[PDB]
């Protein structure tokens, strides 16, 4: 199955997922000088006050914090988006070392990790139908650098020892994703794809310019997770990021002048 190792990693994915070589793949390098301010972007609205987290799952690639998406409890609107996008899950990508781990890069800079808050367009009824549409998903991406601890991340960090291996899950109710945001909502946006198989070209990417700071101790606990299942030889869950893909016939727009 696909993964991140030498024998099943990003350079192999195209054999089972030929869209890996498609026209709007993610992530990309964000060339900040080329990105253009877009006055047509409306104000971005992150409305997470009524979010209902449910569970945290190690899926063998990352860990997902899952939300109740059976109604508009936590939504993203505005910016480049037409209509309402409902939060379904968040997860991270991270490195073996602080010098790599992000999927998007900024003028080729790699951050230590990247948070993805995944939302689906409610006009399509369900996530599964949304991923058949060219505007089905919106992913809010947030870079992580290593410095001061992020207090709103600590609850996530502290549950990871209970989901060490692939297929383990734990209750994760009453988690507030607002504690993962930076101060500024300045962003870059472009049309792209899922960054993991099936690599579907459904995503409006919204990548915040301001990183959040997390402590070394916090990211070190991400790196204690395992890709493998219980009882199998330990393979640390590190370097679960896809590198930047060709921009092709796309422009990155900036929300800020
Ligand atoms: C088994 O070996 C595999 C399985 C899947 C893949 S891929 N194309 O999904 O990366 C490669 C080797
Ligand atoms: C069912 C797969 O759902 C996904 C896969 C990848 C992403 S990401 N890494 O592009 O945010 C989101 C949802
Ligand atoms: O033709 C001019 C237009 O070119 C496009 O590629 C840019 O996105 C627009 O901002 C610009 O106004
Ligand atoms: O908010 C997410 C989780 O944080 C901590 O683990 C709490 O002990 C738990 O009750 C809660 O589900
Ligand atoms: Zn992701």
Curated annotation (Swiss-Prot):
The active site is at 61 (proton donor/acceptor). Zinc. Can also use cobalt(II) with lower efficiency, but not copper(II), nickel(II) and manganese(II). GO terms for biological process: angiotensin-activated signaling pathway; carbon dioxide transport; morphogenesis of an epithelium; neuron cellular homeostasis; positive regulation of cellular pH reduction; positive regulation of dipeptide transmembrane transport; positive regulation of synaptic transmission, GABAergic; regulation of chloride transport. It catalyses: hydrogencarbonate + H(+) = CO2 + H2O; urea = cyanamide + H2O. GO terms for cellular component: apical part of cell; cytoplasm; cytosol; extracellular exosome; myelin sheath; plasma membrane. Changing residue 59 to V: Reduced activity. Its main location: cytoplasm. Changing residue 64 to Q: 2-fold decrease in enzyme efficiency, as determined by kcat/KM ratio, and efficiently inhibited by chlorzolamide. The record marks 89 as: Involved in the binding of some activators, including histamine and L-histidine. Optimum pH is 6-8. Changing residue 116 to D/N/Q: Reduced activity. Its cofactor is Zn(2+); Co(2+). Changing residue 195 to S/V: Reduced activity. Activated by X-ray, histamine, L-adrenaline, L- and D-phenylalanine, L- and D-histidine, L-His-OMe and beta-Ala-His (carnosine). Target of drugs used in treatments against glaucoma disorder and breast cancer. This is Carbonic anhydrase 2.
């Amino acid at each position: 199955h696909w993964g991140y190792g030498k024998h099943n990693g990003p350079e192999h994915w195209h054999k089972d997922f030929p869209i890996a070589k498609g026209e709007r793949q993610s992530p990309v390098d964000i060339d900040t000088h080329t990105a253009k301010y877009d006055p047509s972007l409306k104000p971005l609205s992150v409305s997470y006050d009524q979010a209902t987290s449910l569970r945290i799952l190690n899926n063998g690639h990352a860990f997902n914090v899952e939300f109740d998406d059976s109604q508009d409890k936590a939504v993203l609107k505005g910016g480049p988006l037409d209509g309402t996008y409902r939060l379904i899950q968040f997860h991270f990508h991270w490195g073996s070392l602080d010098g790599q781990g992000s999927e998007h890069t900024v003028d080729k800079k790699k951050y230590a990790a990247e948070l993805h808050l995944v939302h689906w367009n409610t006009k399509y009824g369900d996530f599964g139908k949304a991923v058949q549409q060219p505007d089905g998903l919106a992913v809010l991406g947030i870079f992580l650098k290593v410095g001061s601890a992020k207090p709103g991340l600590q609850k996530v960090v502290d549950v990871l020892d209970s989901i060490k291996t692939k297929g383990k899950s734990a209750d994760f109710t009453n988690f507030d994703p607002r504690g993962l945001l930076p101060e500024s909502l300045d962003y870059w946006t472009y049309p792209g794809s899922l960054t993991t198989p099936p690599l579907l070209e459904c995503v409006t990417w919204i990548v915040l310019k301001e990183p959040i700071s997390v402590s070394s101790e916090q990211v070190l606990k991400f790196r204690k997770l395992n890709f493998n299942g219980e009882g199998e030889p330990e393979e640390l869950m590190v370097d679960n990021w896809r590198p930047a893909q060709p921009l092709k016939n796309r422009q990155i727009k900036a929300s800020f002048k």
